[PDB]
Design a protein around this motif. Structure first.
Motif, PDB file in Angstrom:
ATOM      1  N   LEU A  22       0.816  -1.206   0.000  1.00  0.00           N
ATOM      2  CA  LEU A  22       0.000   0.000   0.000  1.00  0.00           C
ATOM      3  C   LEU A  22       0.852   1.260   0.000  1.00  0.00           C
ATOM      4  O   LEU A  22       0.445   2.268  -0.586  1.00  0.00           O
ATOM      5  CB  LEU A  22      -0.936  -0.010   1.208  1.00  0.00           C
ATOM      6  CG  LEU A  22      -1.964  -1.144   1.228  1.00  0.00           C
ATOM      7  CD1 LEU A  22      -2.757  -1.139   2.522  1.00  0.00           C
ATOM      8  CD2 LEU A  22      -2.895  -1.048   0.032  1.00  0.00           C
ATOM      9  N   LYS A  23       2.018   1.220   0.646  1.00  0.00           N
ATOM     10  CA  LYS A  23       2.979   2.309   0.525  1.00  0.00           C
ATOM     11  C   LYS A  23       3.406   2.515  -0.922  1.00  0.00           C
ATOM     12  O   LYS A  23       3.382   3.642  -1.428  1.00  0.00           O
ATOM     13  CB  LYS A  23       4.197   2.027   1.401  1.00  0.00           C
ATOM     14  CG  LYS A  23       5.303   3.053   1.272  1.00  0.00           C
ATOM     15  CD  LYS A  23       4.893   4.408   1.812  1.00  0.00           C
ATOM     16  CE  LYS A  23       6.031   5.400   1.649  1.00  0.00           C
ATOM     17  NZ  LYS A  23       7.221   4.979   2.437  1.00  0.00           N
ATOM     18  N   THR A  24       3.802   1.435  -1.598  1.00  0.00           N
ATOM     19  CA  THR A  24       4.288   1.553  -2.968  1.00  0.00           C
ATOM     20  C   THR A  24       3.194   2.049  -3.904  1.00  0.00           C
ATOM     21  O   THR A  24       3.448   2.886  -4.778  1.00  0.00           O
ATOM     22  CB  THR A  24       4.829   0.205  -3.443  1.00  0.00           C
ATOM     23  OG1 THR A  24       5.897  -0.210  -2.583  1.00  0.00           O
ATOM     24  CG2 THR A  24       5.347   0.311  -4.869  1.00  0.00           C
ATOM     25  N   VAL A  25       1.973   1.545  -3.736  1.00  0.00           N
ATOM     26  CA  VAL A  25       0.875   1.981  -4.590  1.00  0.00           C
ATOM     27  C   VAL A  25       0.504   3.424  -4.284  1.00  0.00           C
ATOM     28  O   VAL A  25       0.175   4.202  -5.189  1.00  0.00           O
ATOM     29  CB  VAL A  25      -0.327   1.035  -4.430  1.00  0.00           C
ATOM     30  CG1 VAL A  25      -1.516   1.537  -5.237  1.00  0.00           C
ATOM     31  CG2 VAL A  25       0.060  -0.366  -4.859  1.00  0.00           C
ATOM     32  N   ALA A  26       0.580   3.815  -3.015  1.00  0.00           N
ATOM     33  CA  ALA A  26       0.277   5.175  -2.593  1.00  0.00           C
ATOM     34  C   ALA A  26       1.184   6.208  -3.240  1.00  0.00           C
ATOM     35  O   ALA A  26       0.896   7.407  -3.165  1.00  0.00           O
ATOM     36  CB  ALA A  26       0.368   5.284  -1.070  1.00  0.00           C
ATOM     37  N   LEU A  27       2.269   5.772  -3.875  1.00  0.00           N
ATOM     38  CA  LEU A  27       3.226   6.677  -4.491  1.00  0.00           C
ATOM     39  C   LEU A  27       2.688   7.343  -5.749  1.00  0.00           C
ATOM     40  O   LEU A  27       2.757   8.570  -5.867  1.00  0.00           O
ATOM     41  CB  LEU A  27       4.516   5.925  -4.816  1.00  0.00           C
ATOM     42  CG  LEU A  27       5.169   5.324  -3.571  1.00  0.00           C
ATOM     43  CD1 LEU A  27       6.443   4.568  -3.920  1.00  0.00           C
ATOM     44  CD2 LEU A  27       5.416   6.392  -2.521  1.00  0.00           C
ATOM     45  N   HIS A  28       2.154   6.574  -6.695  1.00  0.00           N
ATOM     46  CA  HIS A  28       1.586   7.128  -7.920  1.00  0.00           C
ATOM     47  C   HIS A  28       0.084   6.853  -7.927  1.00  0.00           C
ATOM     48  O   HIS A  28      -0.361   5.730  -8.172  1.00  0.00           O
ATOM     49  CB  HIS A  28       2.268   6.514  -9.152  1.00  0.00           C
ATOM     50  CG  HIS A  28       3.730   6.813  -9.255  1.00  0.00           C
ATOM     51  ND1 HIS A  28       4.683   6.128  -8.533  1.00  0.00           N
ATOM     52  CD2 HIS A  28       4.405   7.705 -10.017  1.00  0.00           C
ATOM     53  CE1 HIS A  28       5.881   6.597  -8.835  1.00  0.00           C
ATOM     54  NE2 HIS A  28       5.740   7.555  -9.732  1.00  0.00           N
ATOM     55  N   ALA A  29      -0.703   7.896  -7.656  1.00  0.00           N
ATOM     56  CA  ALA A  29      -2.134   7.885  -7.940  1.00  0.00           C
ATOM     57  C   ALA A  29      -2.641   9.318  -7.923  1.00  0.00           C
ATOM     58  O   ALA A  29      -2.041  10.175  -7.268  1.00  0.00           O
ATOM     59  CB  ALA A  29      -2.902   7.036  -6.921  1.00  0.00           C
ATOM     60  N   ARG A  30      -3.754   9.576  -8.612  1.00  0.00           N
ATOM     61  CA  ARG A  30      -4.438  10.849  -8.406  1.00  0.00           C
ATOM     62  C   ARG A  30      -5.344  10.804  -7.186  1.00  0.00           C
ATOM     63  O   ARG A  30      -5.367  11.758  -6.400  1.00  0.00           O
ATOM     64  CB  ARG A  30      -5.234  11.247  -9.645  1.00  0.00           C
ATOM     65  CG  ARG A  30      -4.366  11.574 -10.833  1.00  0.00           C
ATOM     66  CD  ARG A  30      -3.541  12.827 -10.602  1.00  0.00           C
ATOM     67  NE  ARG A  30      -2.681  13.122 -11.744  1.00  0.00           N
ATOM     68  CZ  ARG A  30      -3.075  13.788 -12.823  1.00  0.00           C
ATOM     69  NH1 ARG A  30      -4.322  14.230 -12.913  1.00  0.00           N
ATOM     70  NH2 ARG A  30      -2.225  14.011 -13.816  1.00  0.00           N
ATOM     71  N   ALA A  80      -8.069  -1.208 -11.212  1.00  0.00           N
ATOM     72  CA  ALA A  80      -6.957  -2.128 -11.401  1.00  0.00           C
ATOM     73  C   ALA A  80      -6.002  -1.686 -12.500  1.00  0.00           C
ATOM     74  O   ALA A  80      -4.955  -2.316 -12.680  1.00  0.00           O
ATOM     75  CB  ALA A  80      -7.478  -3.533 -11.716  1.00  0.00           C
ATOM     76  N   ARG A  81      -6.336  -0.625 -13.241  1.00  0.00           N
ATOM     77  CA  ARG A  81      -5.459  -0.189 -14.324  1.00  0.00           C
ATOM     78  C   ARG A  81      -4.257   0.582 -13.800  1.00  0.00           C
ATOM     79  O   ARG A  81      -3.182   0.533 -14.408  1.00  0.00           O
ATOM     80  CB  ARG A  81      -6.241   0.649 -15.337  1.00  0.00           C
ATOM     81  CG  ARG A  81      -5.410   1.171 -16.503  1.00  0.00           C
ATOM     82  CD  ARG A  81      -4.719   0.057 -17.259  1.00  0.00           C
ATOM     83  NE  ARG A  81      -3.954   0.559 -18.394  1.00  0.00           N
ATOM     84  CZ  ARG A  81      -3.013  -0.139 -19.021  1.00  0.00           C
ATOM     85  NH1 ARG A  81      -2.721  -1.367 -18.617  1.00  0.00           N
ATOM     86  NH2 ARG A  81      -2.363   0.388 -20.049  1.00  0.00           N
ATOM     87  N   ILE A  82      -4.413   1.299 -12.686  1.00  0.00           N
ATOM     88  CA  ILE A  82      -3.238   1.856 -12.029  1.00  0.00           C
ATOM     89  C   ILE A  82      -2.278   0.743 -11.653  1.00  0.00           C
ATOM     90  O   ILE A  82      -1.100   0.776 -12.023  1.00  0.00           O
ATOM     91  CB  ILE A  82      -3.637   2.685 -10.793  1.00  0.00           C
ATOM     92  CG1 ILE A  82      -4.409   3.935 -11.210  1.00  0.00           C
ATOM     93  CG2 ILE A  82      -2.403   3.062  -9.987  1.00  0.00           C
ATOM     94  CD1 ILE A  82      -4.998   4.700 -10.053  1.00  0.00           C
ATOM     95  N   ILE A  83      -2.765  -0.262 -10.933  1.00  0.00           N
ATOM     96  CA  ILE A  83      -1.929  -1.378 -10.507  1.00  0.00           C
ATOM     97  C   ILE A  83      -1.302  -2.093 -11.693  1.00  0.00           C
ATOM     98  O   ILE A  83      -0.086  -2.039 -11.876  1.00  0.00           O
ATOM     99  CB  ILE A  83      -2.752  -2.343  -9.639  1.00  0.00           C
ATOM    100  CG1 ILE A  83      -3.203  -1.634  -8.364  1.00  0.00           C
ATOM    101  CG2 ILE A  83      -1.929  -3.567  -9.295  1.00  0.00           C
ATOM    102  CD1 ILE A  83      -4.207  -2.415  -7.559  1.00  0.00           C
ATOM    103  N   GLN A  84      -2.104  -2.757 -12.528  1.00  0.00           N
ATOM    104  CA  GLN A  84      -1.534  -3.492 -13.650  1.00  0.00           C
ATOM    105  C   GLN A  84      -0.710  -2.590 -14.560  1.00  0.00           C
ATOM    106  O   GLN A  84       0.130  -3.088 -15.316  1.00  0.00           O
ATOM    107  CB  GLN A  84      -2.635  -4.178 -14.453  1.00  0.00           C
ATOM    108  CG  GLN A  84      -3.470  -5.122 -13.617  1.00  0.00           C
ATOM    109  CD  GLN A  84      -4.432  -5.950 -14.440  1.00  0.00           C
ATOM    110  OE1 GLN A  84      -4.722  -5.626 -15.589  1.00  0.00           O
ATOM    111  NE2 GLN A  84      -4.946  -7.023 -13.845  1.00  0.00           N
ATOM    112  N   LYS A  85      -0.938  -1.281 -14.498  1.00  0.00           N
ATOM    113  CA  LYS A  85      -0.057  -0.299 -15.111  1.00  0.00           C
ATOM    114  C   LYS A  85       1.176  -0.019 -14.264  1.00  0.00           C
ATOM    115  O   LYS A  85       2.269   0.159 -14.812  1.00  0.00           O
ATOM    116  CB  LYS A  85      -0.826   1.003 -15.345  1.00  0.00           C
ATOM    117  CG  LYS A  85      -0.038   2.088 -16.043  1.00  0.00           C
ATOM    118  CD  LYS A  85      -0.888   3.333 -16.189  1.00  0.00           C
ATOM    119  CE  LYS A  85      -2.057   3.094 -17.124  1.00  0.00           C
ATOM    120  NZ  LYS A  85      -1.600   2.825 -18.514  1.00  0.00           N
ATOM    121  N   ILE A  86       1.020   0.019 -12.938  1.00  0.00           N
ATOM    122  CA  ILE A  86       2.105   0.328 -12.017  1.00  0.00           C
ATOM    123  C   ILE A  86       2.437  -0.855 -11.116  1.00  0.00           C
ATOM    124  O   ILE A  86       3.568  -1.353 -11.127  1.00  0.00           O
ATOM    125  CB  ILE A  86       1.777   1.578 -11.174  1.00  0.00           C
ATOM    126  CG1 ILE A  86       1.626   2.796 -12.087  1.00  0.00           C
ATOM    127  CG2 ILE A  86       2.854   1.821 -10.134  1.00  0.00           C
ATOM    128  CD1 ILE A  86       1.049   4.009 -11.400  1.00  0.00           C
TER     129      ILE A  86
END
Length: 105
Positions: A22-30, A80-86
């Motif tokens: 969740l830290k890593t995902v929290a890095l790139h999102a709007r 899931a497009r942020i994730i599978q993208k990032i």
DNA sequence: TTTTCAACATATATTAGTAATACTTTTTCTGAAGATAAAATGACTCCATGG
């Protein structure tokens, strides 16, 4: 009768089948906020179709902000497009409505 | 100035899903006179040595 009940929101769930950071995902999102001191998961939202849903650490999620199903699985896949993208592979699995909201007069 | 509005907002309750933590409970689980007696009193005697 002649007046139809209305759909306010529909709550669902989706499992990504993989655990992430969740830290890593929290890095790139709007749409993100993450404070385990406050709540252990990350905020995810969108402007259209004006949905929040949710995300977990284990790689599961709840679906909120969906006025209909055309918006829900639509948005459910989109988050899931942020994730599978990032982030990780995170497929779309176990999609079921947890609740449906409605109101009328 | 005061009063009515308004207005802003924020709980309040449902149903969820988590997930995690913290927090209370509960449930073990131990660390009046005259007999009766008890003992101190004392005499008796077996039994010791010694001149």
């Amino acid at each position: 009768s002649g007046i139809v009940p209305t759909l306010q929101n529909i709550v669902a769930t989706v499992t990504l089948g993989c655990r992430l950071d969740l830290k890593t995902v929290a890095l790139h999102a709007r749409n993100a906020e993450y404070n385990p001191k406050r709540f252990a998961a990350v905020i995810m939202r969108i402007r259209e179709p004006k949905t929040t849903a949710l995300i977990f650490a284990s790689g599961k999620m709840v679906v909120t902000g969906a006025k209909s199903e055309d918006d829900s699985k639509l948005a459910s896949r989109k988050y899931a497009r942020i994730i599978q993208k990032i982030g990780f592979a995170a497929k779309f699995t176990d999609f079921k409505i947890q609740n449906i909201v409605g109101s009328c007069d």
